[PDB]
Amino acid sequence: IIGGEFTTIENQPWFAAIYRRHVTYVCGGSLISPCWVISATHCFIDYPKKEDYIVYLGRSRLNSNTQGEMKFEVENLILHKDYSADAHHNDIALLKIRSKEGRCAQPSRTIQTIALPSMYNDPQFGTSCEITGFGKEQSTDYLYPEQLKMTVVKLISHRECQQPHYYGSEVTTKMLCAADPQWKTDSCQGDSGGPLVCSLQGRMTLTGIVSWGRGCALKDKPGVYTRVSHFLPWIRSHT
Ligand SMILES: NCc1ccc(C(=O)O)cc1
Numbered sequence: 002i003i004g005g006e007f008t009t010i011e012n013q014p015w016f017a018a019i020y021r022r023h024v025t026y027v028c029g030g031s032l033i034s035p036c037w038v039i040s041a042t043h044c045f046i047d048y049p050k051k052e053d054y055i056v057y058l059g060r061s062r063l064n065s066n067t068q069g070e071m072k073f074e075v076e077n078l079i080l081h082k083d084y085s086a087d088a089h090h091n092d093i094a095l096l097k098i099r100s101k102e103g104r105c106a107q108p109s110r111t112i113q114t115i116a117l118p119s120m121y122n123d124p125q126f127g128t129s130c131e132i133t134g135f136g137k138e139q140s141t142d143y144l145y146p147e148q149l150k151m152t153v154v155k156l157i158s159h160r161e162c163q164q165p166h167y168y169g170s171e172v173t174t175k176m177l178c179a180a181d182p183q184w185k186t187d188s189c190q191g192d193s194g195g196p197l198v199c200s201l202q203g204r205m206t207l208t209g210i211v212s213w214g215r216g217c218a219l220k221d222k223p224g225v226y227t228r229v230s231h232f233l234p235w236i237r238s239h240t
Contacts, residue, residue, distance in 0.1 A: 002136050003218040004186030005152025009061040010070075013133045013151065014113035015207075016196065018057045019096070021048060026063055026145060028194035029134045030056070030096065031207050032114045036105035037240050040194030041210050041227065042080040042094040051078035056098050059111035061149050063135045069111050073098035079239050081232075088171035092212040092227045094194070095239050115196060115207045118230035122201065123177065123208060126158040130179060130199035130208060132224070136192030140217045145191050152186040154179040156199070157223050167221050175231045177209050180223035188224045189217035197226045 010016065017030035017038045030040035038056055045054075052075075060070040077097040084091045098105055106112055124130070133151045137144075162168055162178035172178060179197060180187060188195065188211045197209025209226030216222055229236075 002132065002134050002150040002152050002192055003138060003189050005150050007148045008151045009149065010059050010067060010111045013196070014059070014111055015115035016133045016149070018060050018063070018135065019044070019194065020055045022053045022055070024055065026135060026191065027054065029192060029196070029211070030194045031196040031210070032058060032106060032112070033117055033207065034114055034240065036097050036099065038096045038098055039207070039210065039236065040094045040096060041092045041212055042084045043086060043089045043092050043212070044194045045078055045080060045094060046084065049078065049080065051075040054078065054096070056096060058106050059109060063145055063147050065147070069109060071100065071106055071112065073100050073106070081235065088168070088225070089213050090173065091175070093210060093232050093235070095236065115198065116204060117233065117236065118201065118206045118208055120233050121230050123228070123230055124156060124199045124201055126156045128156045128199055129153050130156065130197055132188050132192065132195060132197055132211060134188060134192030134195040134211065137189045137217070140189060154181055154187060154224065162223060167223065168215070168225065172225060175228050176212070177226045177228045178223035179209070179226060181218070184218050184220045187218040188214070
């Protein structure tokens, strides 16, 4: 996350930190139900083996065990069959979580689920949503922040993101663009699979999943996100 502010897991009780054994940080995710964390397929396409991943819930730091956190193995890693990169397409994945004691996640003050959107129901452009992650704080940074971060970004119309000086055609209607009016804050390397949460009808909804973007916080190059209300049939069936 470029710019923005620091936060703890209580301000995003649904944020999941995903890691890979041969143990490093992989991507963020979102808990949509006790046994399912939703994320981005490009995060796992290179190491499809569910056995190498570890998922945490209620964790606010990248390399320190946050009090009250739950650790989970991936009982199942489901990647979207129609995925394709180069501007990732259908960048969505589902991870079924299960602890060593074979249990899923149990809600607490630091672990809650996030609601999915109603079909094809997205806030109007210009709406302010938030993004969470352990991503880089600066494009030239080598390290990832140790503390979780979040920032605000405004939804951009498909017509506006469609423009050439923007992302041209790389962006599809199954995608949502979001960015800062001054391009001073945005998601970056390490924030993928993370949630784009917007308030829809007075309800916090998982509107988008960090997917891709040209660099970070650069003019006319918004962050692109997998449009969740366009993959509900895929989510319900697969869960
Ligand atoms: N602004 C979206 C975005 C998400 C992820 C990356 C990246 O992993 O390198 C870059 C940009």
